[PDB]
Design an enzyme around this catalytic site. Sequence first.
Site, PDB file in Angstrom:
ATOM      1  CG  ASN A 119    -129.603 -53.633 -41.366  1.00 19.08           C
ATOM      2  OD1 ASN A 119    -129.623 -52.460 -41.749  1.00 19.08           O
ATOM      3  ND2 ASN A 119    -130.680 -54.264 -40.934  1.00 19.08           N
ATOM      4  CG  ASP A 145    -126.248 -56.242 -37.781  1.00 20.88           C
ATOM      5  OD1 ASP A 145    -126.909 -56.371 -38.833  1.00 20.88           O
ATOM      6  OD2 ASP A 145    -126.782 -56.097 -36.656  1.00 20.88           O
ATOM      7  CB  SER A 155    -129.805 -58.105 -38.622  1.00 14.76           C
ATOM      8  OG  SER A 155    -129.663 -56.710 -38.837  1.00 14.76           O
ATOM      9  CG  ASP A 184    -134.038 -53.682 -41.034  1.00 16.12           C
ATOM     10  OD1 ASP A 184    -133.770 -54.272 -39.967  1.00 16.12           O
ATOM     11  OD2 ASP A 184    -133.433 -52.660 -41.417  1.00 16.12           O
ATOM     12  CG  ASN A 236    -132.678 -55.836 -36.993  1.00 15.38           C
ATOM     13  OD1 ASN A 236    -132.084 -56.499 -36.141  1.00 15.38           O
ATOM     14  ND2 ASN A 236    -132.114 -55.467 -38.132  1.00 15.38           N
TER      15      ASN A 236
HETATM   16  C1  LIG Z   1    -137.917 -51.509 -35.791  1.00 13.27           C
HETATM   17  C2  LIG Z   1    -136.646 -52.204 -35.414  1.00 13.27           C
HETATM   18  O1  LIG Z   1    -136.512 -53.420 -35.523  1.00 13.27           O
HETATM   19  N1  LIG Z   1    -135.666 -51.416 -34.954  1.00 13.27           N
HETATM   20  C3  LIG Z   1    -134.359 -51.905 -34.539  1.00 13.27           C
HETATM   21  C4  LIG Z   1    -134.063 -51.473 -33.101  1.00 13.27           C
HETATM   22  O2  LIG Z   1    -134.932 -52.169 -32.213  1.00 13.27           O
HETATM   23  C5  LIG Z   1    -132.611 -51.740 -32.710  1.00 13.27           C
HETATM   24  O3  LIG Z   1    -132.305 -50.968 -31.555  1.00 13.27           O
HETATM   25  C6  LIG Z   1    -132.147 -51.722 -30.347  1.00 13.27           C
HETATM   26  O4  LIG Z   1    -133.372 -52.211 -29.855  1.00 13.27           O
HETATM   27  C7  LIG Z   1    -133.229 -52.949 -28.638  1.00 13.27           C
HETATM   28  C8  LIG Z   1    -134.551 -53.622 -28.371  1.00 13.27           C
HETATM   29  O5  LIG Z   1    -135.450 -52.737 -27.719  1.00 13.27           O
HETATM   30  C9  LIG Z   1    -132.815 -51.984 -27.541  1.00 13.27           C
HETATM   31  O6  LIG Z   1    -132.656 -52.706 -26.324  1.00 13.27           O
HETATM   32  C10 LIG Z   1    -133.326 -52.052 -25.224  1.00 13.27           C
HETATM   33  O7  LIG Z   1    -132.617 -50.885 -24.754  1.00 13.27           O
HETATM   34  C11 LIG Z   1    -133.218 -50.226 -23.622  1.00 13.27           C
HETATM   35  C12 LIG Z   1    -132.334 -49.047 -23.288  1.00 13.27           C
HETATM   36  O8  LIG Z   1    -131.944 -48.346 -24.462  1.00 13.27           O
HETATM   37  C13 LIG Z   1    -133.391 -51.199 -22.453  1.00 13.27           C
HETATM   38  O9  LIG Z   1    -134.091 -50.559 -21.392  1.00 13.27           O
HETATM   39  C14 LIG Z   1    -134.160 -52.429 -22.908  1.00 13.27           C
HETATM   40  O10 LIG Z   1    -134.267 -53.369 -21.846  1.00 13.27           O
HETATM   41  C15 LIG Z   1    -133.450 -53.063 -24.095  1.00 13.27           C
HETATM   42  N2  LIG Z   1    -134.139 -54.266 -24.528  1.00 13.27           N
HETATM   43  C16 LIG Z   1    -133.570 -55.475 -24.489  1.00 13.27           C
HETATM   44  C17 LIG Z   1    -134.415 -56.617 -24.973  1.00 13.27           C
HETATM   45  O11 LIG Z   1    -132.424 -55.640 -24.078  1.00 13.27           O
HETATM   46  C18 LIG Z   1    -131.497 -51.324 -27.919  1.00 13.27           C
HETATM   47  O12 LIG Z   1    -131.228 -50.269 -27.002  1.00 13.27           O
HETATM   48  C19 LIG Z   1    -131.532 -50.737 -29.338  1.00 13.27           C
HETATM   49  N3  LIG Z   1    -130.188 -50.370 -29.758  1.00 13.27           N
HETATM   50  C20 LIG Z   1    -129.837 -49.140 -30.147  1.00 13.27           C
HETATM   51  C21 LIG Z   1    -128.399 -48.962 -30.541  1.00 13.27           C
HETATM   52  O13 LIG Z   1    -130.639 -48.212 -30.176  1.00 13.27           O
HETATM   53  C22 LIG Z   1    -131.647 -51.279 -33.798  1.00 13.27           C
HETATM   54  C23 LIG Z   1    -130.219 -51.699 -33.538  1.00 13.27           C
HETATM   55  O14 LIG Z   1    -130.093 -53.114 -33.527  1.00 13.27           O
HETATM   56  O15 LIG Z   1    -132.022 -51.847 -35.058  1.00 13.27           O
HETATM   57  C24 LIG Z   1    -133.271 -51.392 -35.487  1.00 13.27           C
HETATM   58  O16 LIG Z   1    -133.512 -51.841 -36.781  1.00 13.27           O
END
Ligand SMILES: CC(=O)N[C@@H]1[C@@H](O)[C@H](O[C@@H]2O[C@H](CO)[C@@H](O[C@@H]3O[C@H](CO)[C@@H](O)[C@H](O)[C@H]3NC(C)=O)[C@H](O)[C@H]2NC(C)=O)[C@@H](CO)O[C@H]1O
EC number: 3.2.1.17
Length: 129
Positions: A46, A48, A50, A52, A59
């Site tokens: 990606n 950034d 990272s 997958d 990720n």
């Molecule tokens: C399959 C995969 O790897 N997908 C990746 C996504 O996981 C990632 O999205 C971000 O994931 C994190 C981890 O869950 C999200 O953080 C959480 O957000 C919720 C609220 O939205 C919060 O309640 C949780 O506590 C919080 N978790 C932590 C540990 O802080 C985050 O919101 C996701 N970001 C977005 C923009 O959706 C994305 C982006 O990095 O990448 C995928 O590949």
Amino acid sequence: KVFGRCELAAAMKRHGLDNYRGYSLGNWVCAAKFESNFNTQATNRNTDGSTDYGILQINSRWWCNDGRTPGSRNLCNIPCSALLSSDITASVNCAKKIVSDGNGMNAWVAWRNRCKGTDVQAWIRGCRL
Ligand SMILES: CC(=O)N[C@@H]1[C@@H](O)[C@H](O[C@@H]2O[C@H](CO)[C@@H](O[C@@H]3O[C@H](CO)[C@@H](O)[C@H](O)[C@H]3NC(C)=O)[C@H](O)[C@H]2NC(C)=O)[C@@H](CO)O[C@H]1O
């Protein structure tokens, strides 16, 4: 390993993914098809910095450690290479953590854009489950 469709469905069922957090088996097979084409060895880098990994394209910024990603959290506490195995256990256990983390299967872009809202049980049609 490149899985067959019904072969992967049976493996995911055995590892407890059918209806996990309310997501029927077809959702998981659909996500795997469009994330990796059922190929456990798939990787994609990606913008950034990272990467997958594996059949569900997990990720490296949040979930696994690949030794080269800015600020990784390694929340599944596993090296990313473990997610490329022909045994999907590590990928499934990490996926269960991901899908419990608030946003459900919306964490998978291909699921949101290509599976959500479609008739996903077509993905398990004809399979002996
Ligand atoms: C399959 C995969 O790897 N997908 C990746 C996504 O996981 C990632 O999205 C971000 O994931 C994190 C981890 O869950 C999200 O953080 C959480 O957000 C919720 C609220 O939205 C919060 O309640 C949780 O506590 C919080 N978790 C932590 C540990 O802080 C985050 O919101 C996701 N970001 C977005 C923009 O959706 C994305 C982006 O990095 O990448 C995928 O590949």
